[PDB]
């Protein structure tokens with residue numbers, strides 16, 4: 457009665473705001489979501505985002521480029537916020553990622569009631585299980601969907617252990 | 620050695636920014652920090668913050684009221700960032716808390732080298748230990764004290 461969703465976001469954060477570039481979400485059932493916001497300003501991107509994140513984004517004709525309102529709607533459907541399953545959000549650390557995701561609904565008060573107010577942290581789980589040796593980091597390091605997938609992979613390894 | 624800090628914040632957030640009202644930090648050794656920012660704008664507070672948060676704040680002439688720079692400097696001292704301690708940060712449902720804390724320094728890349736880039740989620744630990752029974756308002760130092768209390772019970 458509970459579905460885990462593994463997510464990662466890319467963004468531009470300056471100490472004041474967090475402007476969403478992209479989000480990838482993978483459910484443990486094989487479903488995938490990925491989108492790139494049409495509303496972030498590429499000029500604001502720092503040097504590191506300009507070289508590592510932006511070049512990996514889809515061509516501007518791609519239907520993966522969506523408005524923020526559209527991404528919100530897409531996520532309400534993808535997370536099945538009106539279905540009977542409870543939702544568990546998982547990310548490597550949450551924090552900035554959780555806020556970026558949740559800001560798609562505006563303030564904290566506006567988040568759909570079934571969306572958890574916290575993200576479970578894979579990093580904490582990994583450490584809780586004695587820091588198992590893990591597979592190496594994939595090649596497309598800063599693509600949000602590739603990242604999310606890899607997080608589901610690691611979650612399965614960490615939890616499918618003998619313990 | 621490793622030192623755990625438990626913290627909580629109050630703020631005004633509007634889906635874009637997080638304007639820090641106050642922060643409370645408690646170390647495992649018993650040390651406590653609390654401050655209220657002289658830089659948030661109470662006019663911008665929603666009705667919920669107006670009624671539950673602001674009236675719990677100290678009177679205006681209390682030296683608990685500090686600038687954002689003073690709070691940053693206060694925290695670098697309280698967390699002992701110049702020492703050889705390793706630091707763990709812990710909060711309960713703390714995604715926005717972690718951002719609020721980090722924004723005291725700027726982007727997260729401005730964080731001092733020894734402060735961790737993530738805050739451990741006390742609610743995840745709780746559920747991982749089988750959701751043991753925890754005891755029984757929106758004052759950040761009282762909240763932070765209470766997280767340590769719960770941590771000690773969860774790990775007892």
Ligand SMILES: Nc1ncnc2c1ncn2[C@@H]1O[C@H](COP(=O)(O)O)[C@@H](O)[C@H]1O
Pocket residue numbers: 564565627628629630631632667668672756757758762
């Ligand atoms: N029921 C609520 N309505 C509006 N904002 C809230 C609510 N609960 C928590 N918050 C926000 O999250 C911050 C942290 O809350 P707390 O640590 O629960 O005292 C508050 O300063 C509020 O801005």
Ligand SMILES: [Mg+2]
Pocket residue numbers: 464465466553
């Ligand atoms: Mg990320």
Ligand SMILES: [Mg+2]
Pocket residue numbers: 627628711712716762
């Ligand atoms: Mg709190």
